[PDB]
Design a protein around this ligand. Structure first.
Ligand SMILES: Nc1ncnc2c1ncn2[C@@H]1O[C@H](COP(=O)(O)OP(=O)(O)O)[C@@H](O)[C@H]1O
Lengths: 70, 51, 478, 593, 593, 228
């Protein structure tokens, strides 16, 4: 029982101190850093897309208003 | 910063590591109360040896 | 005098004030019909209610000039707002008597005194120092902190911020450093020691009133207020103004060090607040984010702030920069500490775990670094054992931390005798070498002797980093 | 000619630029700020200014030169500090006594007043001279004793007049040629566009090592003269220290230290240390500053000049390669180049690829790195040089997933990954052995078999030991030191000895700042012998626990083998290492009885 | 005045709005919908509508109010329930007789029908008057005996006419000034923008404790009048106890409750329990609503209302501080306000910073929290107020990595750390001492040394006792009680007595509803004396188990010490505490024989 | 919700509103948002739906002057079975509590597969009492939750320390969990149990335990209901 309890307590302490305390930072990295950065890059790219689309449509609307005036 | 798995950050890997973390946490609690039972019996046996 | 005689300051220049406001968006104001806009002119905005706030042109396109407003754009009306163009980029009136004065983040005095009675209107964010004109900083300044003298040594002219988080005593450590900073081997020019004092320049960006009062009071208690110029930009002050505050502080530091030859000790607290101001401006301008929403040009701008340090060839002044930045979640990987570490020649890491253990100062030795420590220590300066002792301290501290982590899983019994020695060294180290009084000033030699006393825990044969020549001289009673 | 229409950061858009072309040098503003065209939209041409853009007004002249960004190649490059636009910083400080870099300053890149001693080459009048031909040699330094005045590439003809031996400045005519009726004049110097790599006769395969002096770099992950090396790591890992140590102690005949967007105190450091350090390579004790030229661009200096800095540095390296000199290029941080490109693209409005970087970043990196390999220089006399590009990478957050590192990894052949944890322990140079690699190990077998035949075998032995001990260490920290075989304990202890006494290199101590290849080989042999003999003794009956204590003297001896002075000479060091090996042999023979 | 163009939900492009300012409230449509200008582009003003926009035609008028988002400050503010836009929910209910809030409703924030008794101040005709000057007092309620009438900031001049003593409504002119010929009419109320803090002569250092009446708060984690406090706004944790104790027993002369973005049925509790909360501080039993204003926002209230709720509450608190009244502001869930910010930023399209939160979230939080604090009010006569913010953070199920929670914990000096588990075990007020902290302990040293000199020492001793028991419970659980020394058992027993007696306050009883700071100090002396006497006696060889079985009577006396009725008088309770201390000292002396 | 508002607040009815497939509504909302060229927020869902879900949910509750009331039971499918998804997260922000349907219970054949350990009714205490159902409702619910959690933990230890190594409470807890999940939670799709029938079924399940460790039931109620 001493041998079994020592092995079991060692495994439990390892899980508490290294296994879980490394899986949690790994998950934290994955989601909070990288998924957020990928979503942020998608946000920036789609916002740049929207800016291009709006400036193009605004130029078209300005041209239409000008030829209506003329 | 801290120990790392150095794994491929994707949604599939995020879910994989969340499942792994939950499994490891429940295994830690499981072995903790197993060890509680074992050390209770161990203290009992130590008393038997002592007397 | 003839060098000072040439001024051309009497040439009055009328200013074009424009009612031609076109659009306001976020902190940006757009003006049409601007006659020959300059890229980075300062403008003065007379709002309808009569208040005048300060602006700066960020972009010009033909007849239009994009203006950012430091104090925000609330209340700006196209019909009534008038914009006067100063004609030149941002400048601050500077003088030696401007030491001992308290200022906002925009340079306006708030000590209920007079305006700055200038000697020159130095251009803001001054040009970079010629790398040929620089002098490598190798003059140790004894900060009295054993965690920063024996290890992580600072030399005069080094950029070296304090890495910390919200709640840790970073600003107390900074106050102590400014309190007891001094050369390890002072010039000893005169027994008066008037020029041996550091002329502090302090910039506060987005700090609560409590920290500003703490720094002001601490400078008062040590008689340092007569030598320090404060640039306070508190939490309630405008956020866009946080950008120019460190620029003003570094401009006055440059004037004091490279023009009046004063050993300036620049303190820039809450660099993370400046970072947040930069991020807010960039998100307003829709610029490309580098990481965690911060601008891609964050590294360049932060470097522009930090690199205004060091000392120059023919000039007997120096700017020793010690910023303080709040790590958002105790992460080095965060962009604010990451870029700063990439720029600033080292960092003094304040640790939360050490702080929770009651250790003051909670300087975590391993994450801390001092790049130009290598040349500020040795035979001619400090002691011949300094480098080897510091390296061995680092090695044994790392081994002790690893052995404590091992004990956390395999129990103390399973540890080898070297691991037990390492736990002993770590305990005595953290509690008697890093642990230091808030007003205790340890000379680098006292800290070296304490480090040797700590190292004598191990037998001579396992002090592998220390060279045999040093080890056969200092291990036996020094 | 043209006039500024828009200023937004380093990017300036100039109108009335109908006659200007892509990547053409243009003078911006009344200060004649240097920049190049990166876009044309009708009469409006976008310009990335290479100087500080604050204060530019619309309507000020933007002169267009017609030539691309060109670097002057000739005598005077060596022992000089340069900026991105190759403006001599020393001359800038002398001409403008201010301690700053005045914007728009136009110092000639190479000194036009020094009278260089010119010795004419093997070519005489009437000979057909082609690009890359040496038509004379010039005493530049005592170290670079024959700076060979090449004919400019892309130019050829028949020699009409050649200057006799004497002293000539760079503005004086030296050679006169006649191509097809047009008669051209040549001087000590010639300009070359920094964006077109200098031509070579043929790119040879690099097969000679770039002995950098670092034990781990020389042994486990060797680079070659003509190789491409990446050194990615977080701040404080020590990539600039490794780069500087390479510049000081490599077997290169020339060094081009490019401080691409790094702190200026490093440039002050190299400027103040290099004249104090000497090399016997030229045959006499002579300072390494005579061998090193710099391109300095501090992180606060203009952003686009950061991009120009690598190109002027690599063109200088190519020019010195064309003279048959094994020149090594050190880019202090190419990630700063990448951030400069990202900032310029963000000003331009281009759609980003990843982490904001432009979609063409990988192409630019590959094109820059391909200018490295050993090659036969153009023209005659026949000669061979090399360009060892050793570029440190600074990934954001220390993560090697950074786009700059990822792009660079697929391009470089050597990858010296730096570990932040090892650096924090002050275990420098802190190479992450588990991830670091070198693809030049197979090529270098030809050198090893001729010089150190057992070097690759012992290198593989040490890598096996380190990997075995790494997996052992993770297993132990999961389960504990118990149940380990004595062989496993020997592996762990020997790898700890390696990590603490062979991979360790203090870099600033007299004894081990520079570890010559023979001393590194001897240390490799001694450590492998210790491991093998402990393994054999424990396998042959003995037990490791009392063997370690009964033979601690030999372990301390191999620990102290790193304290051997390289200045004692190869003979003395090898004799003392053989003494160490024999003592270890006899001690392990007697202790296992 | 104006017109309408593009409508996409609340964003409403206007026309002919030449004279509109940024962040200026406007009336949109024929229903006079409230909305603030977000952008200006020539004559076009981007207006975000502060409520539903389903019916809006192109061309129907938009009238500009001329002011930003501002709150009507004056009498009638007490005992009123508002939303973020300070719409009187009650008055809306009786005016419309409606279950819902009608769209475009414009009932005045302050009641214009109530006639208030006005007593003019020291200022006479012809006197120069400045902002913040008290020119009259108005008897608002019995708790607010005199709602002093402040001259609005940014306004000053010579008093030309002032209304005599009488009874007035808000619309009626009360005072008249002339500044430089221009003539201004001031009435019984005024409007101040919410996003600019109300100016003060000097922001003093908050150094007088905020006596909440809870032993754990007043002793271990003390807040300060003008301090800042953060709370976890979870469900099971008894935060209702904290809010009711601050609004019922604290030193505050006014209470501002800001229910920003709360649930529908949670605001029902908040609005239904407050009317029956009663106070005795006035000397007569009166409702706390006479002293308290509620800002109530269910999650379906408009996003602008939820975002501006905290600013409205803090502006009301600043207004009551400027009268010299210590006011406490309680934010129901600042995380809901941050969610409102995230929605606003998303709808404006601003680039995010941390998983959607805008780049200025930290800046906005810091600026808002800096508005709190003790300060000398602007103008004359000299007076000092204080605003204490007690804000609760409720992230996604305890995810305290939220940037909102991170910033709040980095700004607030006090964290009271309510715990779910302590509420499960019915250990009210359920403060998790392990994680809770207070950074005002150093500042309150002045107050303690002035009044209760031993308070900091006893507080630190109690902290040490609880921490020692907390860290020793693990070794107990792992090894068994037999491994514990006698002194460790002393620490455990005394700490358990502390948890059951001092930290645990019934609150719903009569002896524990309000534990005054002096009674708290007496109890700390009692408990620390018990621990010290036990420690000393056992250090004198005495076995702790025998004393525990023997000194249960003094332990019971200490247990019943919390039953001492504070209403019995400070002198009487101090005398009985002295008798308790004498008895415990004597009985320890007897039992240690 | 307009119909429910009309009925409850004008006809004075008690109205229950079941909004099934809230996730499908969220998908539709995202489609509408991207139709207006709005840039998607978190997880592609637009960043403003906390407001829209709030407008849907808050159209409930009982009011001062009307005897009617609105009770809402939104039903949303968690995509990939996580709470961190925007839809369940926002619904948890706006709504009081949640009922959980568990895949593990569903695979065992239990209907309804309601996992009661995670499910919570925040303001359940207001629905239970003397004039509100029965005086024993709250403590019987608490005891059921406690014994069910203990039974799950004992089922974990059944395969780790063995059946015989468990404590007597754990041996009772295994069979209590068996009877609970497959008789009390397991209710036919057309079996209508009134609250009192369900309460006395819960009592019949709780009658296996002894007096000493039915500790989360008040001793008055326990001594009035358990002992006969
Ligand atoms: N091989 C080495 N030997 C001794 N010290 C080193 C070594 N490498 C780095 N260091 C120390 O660590 C610091 C590393 O800084 P640096 O080389 O600039 O790294 P990075 O460029 O990655 O920030 C140096 O200033 C030096 O003091």
């Amino acid at each position: 029982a001493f041998i079994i309890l020592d092995e079991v307590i060692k495994v439990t302490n390892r899980r508490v101190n290294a296994i879980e305390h490394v899986i949690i930072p790994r998950t934290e990295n994955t989601i909070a850093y990288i998924n957020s950065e990928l979503d942020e890059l998608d946000r920036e790219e789609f916002y740049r897309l929207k800016k291009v689309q709006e400036k193009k449509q605004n130029e078209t609307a300005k041209l239409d208003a000008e030829m209506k005036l003329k | 910063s801290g120990n790392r798995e150095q794994v491929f950050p994707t949604r599939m890997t995020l879910g994989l590591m969340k499942t792994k973390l939950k499994g490891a946490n429940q295994g830690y609690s499981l072995l903790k109360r197993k060890s509680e039972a074992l050390t209770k019996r161990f203290r009992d046996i130590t008393k038997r040896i002592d007397d | 005098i003839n060098k000072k005689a040439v001024e051309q300051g009497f040439n009055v220049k009328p200013r074009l004030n424009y009612n031609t406001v076109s659009g306001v968006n976020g902190p940006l104001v757009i003006l049409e019909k601007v006659k020959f806009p300059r890229y980075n002119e300062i403008v003065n905005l007379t709002l309808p209610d009569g208040t005048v706030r300060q602006g700066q042109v960020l972009e010009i396109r033909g007849d239009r000039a994009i203006v950012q407003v430091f104090e925000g754009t609330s209340g700006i009306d196209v019909k009534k707002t008038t914009v006067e163009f100063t004609g030149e980029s941002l400048r601050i009136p500077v003088s030696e008597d401007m030491l001992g004065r308290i200022f906002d983040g925009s340079g306006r005095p708030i000590d209920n005194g007079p305006k700055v009675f200038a000697e020159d209107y130095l251009d803001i964010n001054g040009s970079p120092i010629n790398p040929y004109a620089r002098i490598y900083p190798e003059e140790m300044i004894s900060t009295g902190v054993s965690a920063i003298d024996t290890m992580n040594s600072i030399a005069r002219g080094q950029k070296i911020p304090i890495f910390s988080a919200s709640g840790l005593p970073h600003n107390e450590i900074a106050a102590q450093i400014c309190r007891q900073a001094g050369l390890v081997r002072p010039t000893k020019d005169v027994h008066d020691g008037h020029e041996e004092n550091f002329s502090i320049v302090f910039a506060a960006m987005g700090v609560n009133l409590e920290t500003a009062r703490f720094f002001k009071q601490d400078f008062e208690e040590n008689g340092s207020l007569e030598r320090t110029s404060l640039f306070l930009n508190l939490a309630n002050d405008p956020t866009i103004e946080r950008i120019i505050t460190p620029r003003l502080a570094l401009t006055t530091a440059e004037y004091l060090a490279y023009q009046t030859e004063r050993h300036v000790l620049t303190i820039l607290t809450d660099m993370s607040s400046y970072a947040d101001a930069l991020r807010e401006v960039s998100a307003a301008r829709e610029e490309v984010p580098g990481r965690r929403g911060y601008p891609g040009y964050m590294y360049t701008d932060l470097s522009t702030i930090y690199e205004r340090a060091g000392r120059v060839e023919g000039r007997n002044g120096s700017i020793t920069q010690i910023p303080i930045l709040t790590m958002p979640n105790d992460d080095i990987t965060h962009p604010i500490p990451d870029l700063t570490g990439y720029i600033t020649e080292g960092q003094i890491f304040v640790d939360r775990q050490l702080h929770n253990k009651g250790i003051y100062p909670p300087i975590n030795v391993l994450p801390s670094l001092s790049r130009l420590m290598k040349s500020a220590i040795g035979e001619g300066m400090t002691r011949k054992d300094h480098g080897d002792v510091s390296n061995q301290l680092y090695a044994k501290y790392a081994i002790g931390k690893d052995a404590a982590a091992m004990k956390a899983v395999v129990g103390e019994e399973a540890l080898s005798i070297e691991d037990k020695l390492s736990l002993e060294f770590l305990e005595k180290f953290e509690k008697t070498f890093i642990t230091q009084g808030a007003y205790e000033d340890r000379t680098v030699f006292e800290s070296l002797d304490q480090a040797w006393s700590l190292l004598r825990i191990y037998p001579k044969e396992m002090l592998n980093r220390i060279s045999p020549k040093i080890l056969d001289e200092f291990y036996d009673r020094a | 000619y043209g006039a500024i229409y828009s200023v937004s950061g380093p990017v300036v858009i100039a109108e009335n630029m109908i006659g200007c072309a892509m990547y053409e040098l243009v003078k911006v503003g009344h200060d004649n700020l240097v920049g190049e065209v990166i876009r044309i939209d009708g009469d409006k041409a976008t310009i990335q200014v290479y100087e500080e853009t604050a204060g530019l007004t619309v309507g000020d002249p933007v002169l267009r030169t017609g030539k691309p960004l060109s670097v002057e190649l000739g005598p005077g490059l060596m022992e000089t500090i340069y900026d991105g636009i190759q403006r001599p910083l020393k001359a800038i400080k002398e001409e403008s006594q201010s301690i700053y870099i005045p914007r728009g300053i136009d110092t000639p890149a190479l000194d036009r007043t020094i009278k260089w001693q010119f010795t004419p080459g093997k070519f005489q009048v009437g000979d057909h001279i082609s690009g890359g031909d040496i038509y004379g040699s010039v005493f530049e330094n005592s170290l670079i004793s024959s700076h060979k005045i090449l004919l400019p590439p892309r130019s050829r003809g028949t020699i009409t007049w050649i200057a006799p031996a004497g002293e000539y400045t760079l503005d004086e005519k030296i050679l006169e040629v006649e191509f097809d009726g047009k008669k051209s004049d040549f001087t000590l110097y010639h300009t070359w566009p920094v964006r077109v790599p200098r031509p070579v006769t043929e790119k040879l395969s690099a097969d000679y090592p770039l002995l950098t002096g670092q034990r781990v770099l020389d042994a486990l992950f060797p680079c070659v003269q003509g190789g491409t090396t990446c050194i990615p790591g977080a701040f404080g890992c020590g990539k600039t220290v490794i780069s500087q140590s390479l510049s000081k102690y490599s077997n290169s005949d020339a060094i081009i230290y490019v401080g691409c967007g790094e702190r200026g105190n490093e440039m002050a450091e190299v400027l103040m240390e290099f004249p104090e350090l000497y090399t016997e390579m030229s045959g006499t004790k002579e300072p390494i500053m005579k061998r090193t030229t710099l391109v300095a661009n501090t992180s606060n200096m203009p952003v686009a000049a950061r991009e120009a800095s690598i190109y002027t540095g690599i063109t200088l390296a190519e020019y010195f390669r064309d003279q048959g000199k094994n020149v090594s290029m050190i880019a202090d941080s190419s990630s700063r180049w990448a951030e400069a490109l990202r900032e310029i693209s963000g000003r331009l409005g281009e759609m980003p690829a990843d982490q904001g970087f432009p979609a063409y970043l990988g192409a630019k990196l590959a094109s820059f790195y391909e200018r490295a390999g050993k090659a036969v220089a153009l023209g005659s006399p026949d000669r061979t040089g090399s360009v060892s590009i050793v570029a440190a990478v600074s990934p954001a957050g220390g993560d090697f997933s950074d786009p700059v590192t990822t792009a660079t990894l697929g391009i470089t052949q050597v990858f010296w990954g730096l570990d932040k944890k090892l650096a924090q322990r002050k275990h420098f140079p802190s190479i992450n052995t588990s991830v670091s690699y070198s693809k030049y190990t197979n090529v270098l077998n030809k050198f090893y078999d001729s010089n150190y035949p057992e070097f690759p075998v012992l290198r593989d032995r040490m890598k096996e030991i380190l990997s075995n001990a790494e997996e052992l260490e993770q297993v132990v920290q999961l389960v504990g030191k118990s149940a380990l075989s004595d062989s496993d304990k020997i592996t762990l202890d020997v790898a700890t000895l390696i990590k603490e006494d062979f991979l360790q290199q203090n870099g600033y101590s007299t004894y081990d700042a520079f570890c010559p290849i023979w001393k590194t080989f001897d240390m490799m042999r001694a450590f492998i012998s210790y491991h093998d003999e402990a393994q054999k003794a424990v396998a042959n009956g003995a037990n490791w626990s009392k063997l370690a204590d009964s033979t601690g003297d030999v372990k301390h001896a191999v620990s102290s083998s790193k304290f051997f002075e390289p200045s004692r000479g190869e003979k003395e060091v090898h004799g003392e290492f053989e003494k160490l090996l024999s003592t270890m042999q006899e001690r392990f023979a007697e202790s296992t009885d």
